[PDB]
Coordinates of C-alpha atoms in Angstrom, one line a residue:
Chain A
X203 CA 87.5 75.5 87.6
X204 CA 87.5 71.6 88.9
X205 CA 84.7 71.0 91.9
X206 CA 87.2 68.0 94.0
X207 CA 84.4 66.1 95.3
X208 CA 86.2 64.1 98.2
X209 CA 89.2 65.7 99.2
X210 CA 87.5 69.2 100.6
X211 CA 89.6 71.0 98.4
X212 CA 87.9 74.4 97.2
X213 CA 84.7 73.4 99.2
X214 CA 80.7 73.5 98.3
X215 CA 80.2 75.0 95.0
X216 CA 78.5 78.6 96.0
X217 CA 81.9 79.4 96.2
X218 CA 83.3 77.3 93.4
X219 CA 80.7 79.5 90.8
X220 CA 81.2 82.8 92.5
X221 CA 85.3 82.5 93.0
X222 CA 84.9 81.7 89.5
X223 CA 83.8 84.7 88.1
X224 CA 86.6 86.8 90.3
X225 CA 89.4 84.8 89.4
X226 CA 90.5 85.7 85.4
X227 CA 88.9 88.6 84.5
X228 CA 91.6 90.8 85.9
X229 CA 88.9 93.5 86.9
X230 CA 90.5 95.0 89.5
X231 CA 91.3 94.9 93.0
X232 CA 88.3 96.9 93.8
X233 CA 85.8 96.1 90.9
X234 CA 85.7 92.2 92.5
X235 CA 85.5 94.1 96.3
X236 CA 82.0 95.9 94.6
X237 CA 80.6 92.5 92.9
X238 CA 80.6 91.0 95.9
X239 CA 78.7 93.9 97.6
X240 CA 76.1 94.0 95.7
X241 CA 75.7 90.2 96.0
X242 CA 76.0 91.1 99.7
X243 CA 78.7 88.1 100.2
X244 CA 81.5 88.8 102.9
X245 CA 82.9 85.6 102.8
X246 CA 83.8 85.7 99.4
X247 CA 85.1 89.2 100.4
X248 CA 87.1 88.6 103.1
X249 CA 88.5 85.8 101.9
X250 CA 89.5 85.6 98.3
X251 CA 89.4 90.3 98.1
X252 CA 90.8 90.7 101.6
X253 CA 94.3 88.2 101.1
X254 CA 97.3 88.6 102.2
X255 CA 99.5 90.7 100.1
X256 CA 96.5 92.6 97.9
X257 CA 98.0 95.3 96.8
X258 CA 95.7 98.4 97.7
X259 CA 95.3 101.3 95.2
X260 CA 94.3 104.8 97.5
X261 CA 90.8 105.6 98.8
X262 CA 89.4 103.0 96.2
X263 CA 88.8 101.6 99.0
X264 CA 86.9 104.9 100.4
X265 CA 84.2 105.0 97.7
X266 CA 83.6 101.4 98.6
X267 CA 82.5 102.8 102.2
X268 CA 80.7 105.4 100.3
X269 CA 79.1 102.7 98.6
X270 CA 77.9 100.4 101.4
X271 CA 76.7 103.1 103.5
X272 CA 73.9 104.0 100.9
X273 CA 72.7 100.6 100.0
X274 CA 72.3 99.6 103.8
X275 CA 75.5 96.6 103.4
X276 CA 75.9 96.6 107.5
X277 CA 78.8 94.3 106.9
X278 CA 81.2 95.5 104.6
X279 CA 81.3 98.9 106.9
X280 CA 82.5 96.3 109.6
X281 CA 85.3 94.7 107.5
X282 CA 86.0 98.3 105.9
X283 CA 86.8 99.4 109.4
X284 CA 88.6 96.8 109.9
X285 CA 91.3 96.5 107.3
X286 CA 92.3 99.5 107.1
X287 CA 89.5 102.5 106.3
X288 CA 88.9 105.6 109.2
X289 CA 85.8 107.2 109.1
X290 CA 87.6 110.7 110.9
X291 CA 89.8 110.7 107.6
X292 CA 86.8 109.2 105.5
Chain B
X1120 CA 117.4 116.7 124.0
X1121 CA 113.6 116.8 125.1
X1122 CA 111.9 113.7 124.1
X1123 CA 109.5 116.2 122.6
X1124 CA 107.6 113.2 121.6
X1125 CA 105.2 111.4 124.5
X1126 CA 101.5 111.2 125.0
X1127 CA 99.1 108.4 123.7
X1128 CA 99.3 106.6 119.9
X1129 CA 96.1 105.4 120.7
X1130 CA 95.2 103.4 117.3
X1131 CA 92.6 104.7 115.1
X1132 CA 91.1 101.2 115.6
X1133 CA 88.9 98.5 113.8
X1134 CA 86.6 97.2 116.0
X1135 CA 87.6 99.0 119.0
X1136 CA 89.5 102.3 119.5
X1137 CA 93.1 100.1 121.2
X1138 CA 94.6 103.0 123.1
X1139 CA 98.9 103.3 123.7
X1140 CA 101.5 105.3 125.2
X1141 CA 104.8 106.3 123.4
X1142 CA 107.8 108.6 124.9
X1143 CA 110.1 108.4 122.2
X1144 CA 113.3 108.2 124.6
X1145 CA 117.4 108.5 123.7
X1146 CA 120.1 106.0 123.4
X1147 CA 121.5 106.5 126.3
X1148 CA 118.5 106.5 128.8
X1149 CA 119.2 104.5 132.4
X1150 CA 117.2 101.8 133.6
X1151 CA 116.4 103.1 136.4
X1152 CA 114.5 106.0 134.9
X1153 CA 113.2 103.5 131.9
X1154 CA 111.6 101.1 134.6
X1155 CA 110.5 104.6 136.6
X1156 CA 108.3 106.0 133.8
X1157 CA 106.6 102.2 133.4
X1158 CA 105.0 102.2 137.1
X1159 CA 105.1 105.7 138.0
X1160 CA 103.2 107.6 135.0
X1161 CA 101.8 104.5 133.1
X1162 CA 100.6 103.3 136.5
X1163 CA 101.5 99.9 135.6
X1164 CA 101.9 96.9 138.5
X1165 CA 105.0 94.6 138.4
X1166 CA 104.6 91.5 137.0
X1167 CA 105.0 88.2 137.7
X1168 CA 106.6 87.5 134.7
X1169 CA 108.4 88.6 131.1
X1170 CA 107.7 86.7 127.5
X1171 CA 110.3 88.2 125.4
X1172 CA 109.2 87.2 122.4
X1173 CA 112.4 87.1 119.5
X1174 CA 111.7 85.5 116.1
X1175 CA 112.4 87.9 113.3
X1176 CA 110.5 90.8 110.9
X1177 CA 108.4 89.9 107.8
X1178 CA 107.4 86.0 109.5
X1179 CA 105.0 86.0 106.2
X1180 CA 102.1 83.2 106.7
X1181 CA 102.6 80.6 110.0
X1182 CA 100.2 78.1 109.3
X1183 CA 96.2 77.2 110.6
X1184 CA 97.0 75.0 113.7
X1185 CA 99.9 76.8 114.9
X1186 CA 98.0 79.6 115.1
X1187 CA 95.2 78.1 116.9
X1188 CA 98.1 76.2 120.0
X1189 CA 100.6 79.3 120.0
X1190 CA 97.6 82.0 120.5
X1191 CA 95.5 80.0 123.3
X1192 CA 98.6 78.8 124.9
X1193 CA 100.4 82.3 125.0
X1194 CA 97.2 84.3 126.5
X1195 CA 96.6 81.3 129.2
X1196 CA 100.3 82.1 131.0
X1197 CA 100.4 86.1 130.3
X1198 CA 96.7 86.3 131.9
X1199 CA 96.5 83.7 134.6
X1200 CA 100.2 85.1 135.7
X1201 CA 100.0 88.8 134.9
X1202 CA 103.0 89.1 132.9
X1203 CA 104.6 91.7 130.1
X1204 CA 104.9 90.7 127.1
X1205 CA 107.9 91.8 125.5
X1206 CA 107.4 92.2 121.2
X1207 CA 109.4 94.5 118.6
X1208 CA 106.0 96.9 117.9
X1209 CA 106.4 96.2 114.4
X1210 CA 103.8 95.1 112.4
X1211 CA 106.0 92.5 110.7
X1212 CA 107.2 89.4 111.7
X1213 CA 106.1 88.2 115.0
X1214 CA 104.2 91.2 116.5
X1215 CA 102.1 90.5 113.7
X1216 CA 101.1 87.0 115.3
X1217 CA 101.2 88.2 118.3
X1218 CA 98.6 90.5 118.0
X1219 CA 97.0 87.9 115.7
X1220 CA 96.8 85.8 118.9
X1221 CA 95.7 88.2 121.4
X1222 CA 92.3 89.4 118.9
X1223 CA 91.7 85.7 119.0
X1224 CA 91.6 85.1 122.3
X1225 CA 91.2 88.4 124.1
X1226 CA 88.7 88.7 126.6
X1227 CA 89.9 92.4 126.7
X1228 CA 92.3 90.7 128.7
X1229 CA 94.6 94.0 128.0
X1230 CA 93.8 94.4 131.6
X1231 CA 95.5 91.9 132.4
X1232 CA 98.2 91.6 129.4
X1233 CA 100.7 94.6 128.9
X1234 CA 101.8 94.2 125.2
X1235 CA 104.9 96.0 124.9
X1236 CA 106.5 97.5 122.0
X1237 CA 110.1 98.3 121.3
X1238 CA 111.4 99.8 117.5
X1239 CA 113.8 102.1 116.6
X1240 CA 112.8 105.8 116.3
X1241 CA 112.2 106.6 112.3
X1242 CA 111.8 102.8 110.5
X1243 CA 108.5 103.9 110.9
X1244 CA 105.3 104.4 108.8
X1245 CA 103.9 107.8 109.5
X1246 CA 106.7 109.0 112.1
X1247 CA 106.0 112.7 111.6
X1248 CA 102.5 113.0 112.9
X1249 CA 103.4 112.1 116.4
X1250 CA 105.7 114.8 117.2
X1251 CA 104.3 117.1 120.5
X1252 CA 104.2 117.4 123.8
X1253 CA 101.2 114.9 125.8
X1254 CA 99.2 114.8 122.2
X1255 CA 96.6 112.1 121.9
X1256 CA 97.7 111.4 118.0
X1257 CA 96.1 109.4 115.1
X1258 CA 97.5 107.1 113.1
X1259 CA 96.2 104.4 110.8
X1260 CA 96.7 101.3 110.1
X1261 CA 96.4 101.0 106.2
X1262 CA 98.4 99.0 104.4
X1263 CA 100.1 101.4 102.2
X1264 CA 101.1 99.7 99.3
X1265 CA 104.2 102.0 98.1
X1266 CA 105.5 101.7 102.3
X1267 CA 108.2 99.3 102.4
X1268 CA 108.4 100.4 105.8
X1269 CA 107.0 99.2 109.3
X1270 CA 103.9 99.8 110.9
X1271 CA 102.9 100.3 114.6
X1272 CA 100.6 96.8 115.8
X1273 CA 96.9 98.2 116.6
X1274 CA 97.0 95.3 119.2
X1275 CA 99.6 96.4 121.5
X1276 CA 99.3 98.5 124.6
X1277 CA 102.4 100.6 124.9
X1278 CA 105.5 101.5 123.4
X1279 CA 108.9 102.5 124.1
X1280 CA 110.6 104.1 121.0
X1281 CA 114.8 104.5 120.7
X1282 CA 116.3 107.2 118.8
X1283 CA 119.6 106.4 117.3
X1284 CA 121.8 107.8 114.0
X1285 CA 118.5 109.0 112.2
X1286 CA 115.8 107.2 110.2
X1287 CA 116.1 103.9 108.6
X1288 CA 118.6 102.9 110.6
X1289 CA 117.5 100.2 112.3
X1290 CA 119.0 98.2 115.4
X1291 CA 119.5 100.6 118.1
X1292 CA 116.9 98.2 120.4
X1293 CA 119.0 95.7 121.8
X1294 CA 120.2 97.0 124.7
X1295 CA 117.5 98.6 126.0
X1296 CA 115.2 95.3 126.3
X1297 CA 118.1 93.8 127.8
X1298 CA 119.3 96.3 130.5
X1299 CA 115.1 96.6 131.1
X1300 CA 114.9 92.2 131.2
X1301 CA 118.3 92.4 133.5
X1302 CA 116.1 95.4 135.8
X1303 CA 113.2 94.0 136.1
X1304 CA 114.8 90.3 137.0
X1305 CA 116.5 92.4 140.0
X1306 CA 112.8 93.0 141.6
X1307 CA 111.4 91.1 144.3
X1308 CA 108.1 89.4 142.8
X1309 CA 106.1 90.1 145.9
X1310 CA 106.2 91.7 149.3
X1311 CA 107.2 88.2 151.2
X1312 CA 109.0 86.7 148.5
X1313 CA 112.8 87.1 147.9
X1314 CA 113.2 85.7 144.2
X1315 CA 113.4 87.5 141.5
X1316 CA 111.2 88.4 139.0
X1317 CA 111.6 85.4 136.6
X1318 CA 112.7 86.3 132.9
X1319 CA 111.6 83.3 129.4
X1320 CA 112.2 84.0 125.9
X1321 CA 109.6 82.7 123.5
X1322 CA 111.3 81.8 119.7
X1323 CA 109.0 81.5 116.5
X1324 CA 110.3 81.2 113.3
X1325 CA 113.8 82.4 114.8
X1326 CA 117.0 83.2 112.2
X1327 CA 121.3 83.6 112.3
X1328 CA 120.9 86.9 114.3
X1329 CA 118.3 84.8 117.1
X1330 CA 120.6 82.2 117.2
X1331 CA 122.9 84.1 118.2
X1332 CA 120.5 86.3 120.3
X1333 CA 119.4 82.3 121.6
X1334 CA 123.2 81.7 122.9
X1335 CA 123.3 84.8 124.2
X1336 CA 121.0 84.1 127.1
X1337 CA 122.7 80.9 128.4
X1338 CA 125.9 82.6 128.7
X1339 CA 123.6 85.2 130.8
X1340 CA 124.4 85.3 134.7
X1341 CA 121.8 84.1 135.4
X1342 CA 121.7 81.9 132.7
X1343 CA 118.1 83.1 131.1
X1344 CA 116.0 80.0 129.2
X1345 CA 114.8 79.5 126.1
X1346 CA 111.4 77.7 125.0
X1347 CA 110.9 76.7 121.3
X1348 CA 108.3 75.6 118.7
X1349 CA 108.2 73.4 116.1
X1350 CA 106.3 73.7 113.2
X1351 CA 107.5 77.6 111.9
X1352 CA 110.1 78.1 109.1
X1353 CA 113.3 79.3 109.9
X1354 CA 116.4 78.5 112.6
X1355 CA 113.5 77.3 115.4
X1356 CA 112.4 74.7 113.4
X1357 CA 116.4 73.8 112.9
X1358 CA 117.0 74.4 116.4
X1359 CA 113.9 71.9 116.7
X1360 CA 115.9 69.9 114.5
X1361 CA 119.4 70.0 116.6
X1362 CA 117.0 69.2 119.3
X1363 CA 116.8 65.3 118.7
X1364 CA 120.4 64.0 117.6
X1365 CA 122.1 65.3 120.4
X1366 CA 123.1 64.1 123.5
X1367 CA 123.7 65.8 127.4
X1368 CA 126.6 68.2 126.2
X1369 CA 128.2 66.5 123.6
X1370 CA 128.8 67.6 120.2
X1371 CA 127.1 65.0 118.1
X1372 CA 126.4 61.4 117.5
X1373 CA 127.7 59.4 114.5
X1374 CA 128.8 62.5 112.4
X1375 CA 126.5 64.6 110.5
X1376 CA 128.3 68.1 110.7
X1377 CA 128.3 68.1 106.7
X1378 CA 124.4 67.4 106.9
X1379 CA 123.9 70.3 109.2
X1380 CA 126.5 72.3 107.6
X1381 CA 124.3 72.0 104.0
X1382 CA 120.8 72.4 106.1
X1383 CA 122.3 75.7 107.2
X1384 CA 123.0 77.1 104.3
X1385 CA 120.6 75.7 102.6
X1386 CA 118.0 78.2 104.7
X1387 CA 120.7 81.0 105.0
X1388 CA 123.1 80.8 101.8
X1389 CA 126.7 81.0 103.4
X1390 CA 128.6 79.0 101.1
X1391 CA 131.3 77.8 104.3
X1392 CA 131.7 81.3 104.5
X1393 CA 131.0 80.5 108.0
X1394 CA 127.9 77.5 107.8
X1395 CA 130.7 76.3 110.1
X1396 CA 130.7 78.9 113.0
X1397 CA 126.6 78.3 112.8
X1398 CA 127.1 75.1 113.8
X1399 CA 129.4 76.7 116.5
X1400 CA 126.5 78.0 118.3
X1401 CA 124.0 75.5 117.4
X1402 CA 126.7 73.2 119.1
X1403 CA 126.5 75.7 122.0
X1404 CA 122.5 75.3 121.8
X1405 CA 122.1 71.7 122.0
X1406 CA 124.9 71.5 125.1
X1407 CA 122.8 73.8 127.2
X1408 CA 120.2 71.8 127.4
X1409 CA 119.0 72.0 130.7
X1410 CA 116.9 76.0 129.9
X1411 CA 115.8 74.6 126.4
Chain C
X326 CA 91.5 119.4 108.5
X327 CA 88.5 121.0 108.5
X328 CA 86.0 119.7 106.6
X329 CA 86.0 116.0 108.7
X330 CA 84.7 116.4 112.2
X331 CA 85.5 115.1 114.8
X332 CA 83.5 113.0 115.9
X333 CA 82.0 111.5 112.7
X334 CA 80.0 108.3 114.6
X335 CA 78.2 110.7 115.4
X336 CA 76.6 111.7 113.0
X337 CA 76.0 109.0 111.2
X338 CA 73.6 107.5 114.5
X339 CA 72.0 110.5 113.2
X340 CA 72.0 109.4 109.7
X341 CA 71.2 106.1 110.1
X342 CA 68.4 107.0 112.9
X343 CA 66.7 109.9 110.6
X344 CA 66.9 107.9 107.6
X345 CA 65.0 104.6 110.0
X346 CA 68.6 102.4 109.6
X347 CA 68.2 100.4 113.0
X348 CA 70.4 97.5 112.1
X349 CA 73.0 100.8 110.6
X350 CA 72.6 102.8 114.2
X351 CA 73.1 99.9 116.2
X352 CA 76.7 98.7 115.0
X353 CA 77.8 102.1 114.6
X354 CA 76.6 103.4 118.4
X355 CA 79.4 100.4 120.0
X356 CA 81.5 101.8 117.8
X357 CA 83.1 105.7 119.5
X358 CA 82.2 107.1 123.0
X359 CA 79.3 108.6 125.5
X360 CA 76.9 104.8 124.4
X361 CA 74.8 106.0 127.0

């Protein structure tokens, strides 16, 4: 990963250092979400995990909610609600 | 047979618990009873404007700046005029981006914006969890990966769903939208004003059947106008390109109909099967420029 | 089903308050009905 300085391509280096750990390293769609959670970085998760066409598995997403509620990760509760999770089913 | 599925299709909702309504009527219900339902039971007010949205299904990555202007612009026309936006309902294509535009510049102005969904009954994911009489229903907008089916858009307010041959069969909704558009235009816009309710059609990334839908309006009595916007990625941007090179009523400046037919088949592959025919449709659309 | 609850945002609001989780309690309060 190169950080092009001048064309605002792939903006400030923090997103680069962290997004670098998400690309390659295939790992899952899930584990990508879990890693942002431990870091408490929703901007990464929203933009670089909840991408268009991201094929989501089965209630793995629910298992993320269970992890966010314990950890007191409020903004990941908000996000997962917006992106399909149901408290009634959960 | 009895409609047997009418109530509240209240989406699970994300930030909110966005509500909605369903009736599941026939494919032969009369236009008088369709309207009668909307204002009597659902307690809707008569609109001073109708905006029908005909783009396509599966429209897939509207641009960044285009998203801002169309939304900000479309909400304003709707809230400032108390309008009914008519979409297809299915969360694929325009109905996605319309609901996206709502969410951006919401102002919870659903109070003043009554988006209505019209689709066939069967082509919709989780079809079976709605059957019943006056039933509050749950519904999951989970992007079920294996599902090639459609999902109803959470950011809508009403739904009318049209039976047909059966499940899978798609394209038996075109009549009801039109007959309703004729019906609303045959209502006076105010207790004091005699003119009928206007109808206008907006086009986002149209298509080889939409360019027949455009013509079908300009042939209509009265001739319903049409709006298009450039920056799209199918027929709207094309018929936008058709716009700049044409004179009033004229079919062509110095002949480029090979190059036009080249572009006609470039987007949707014809091979001069009927790419010529699509040109004479673009001909009659570049003709009546007093409504484009 | 039956192990579910009809109003889960109520069950979580009580949880967040018994666990002394105010920022979570405020969020869950805004979601659901009967806010007052």
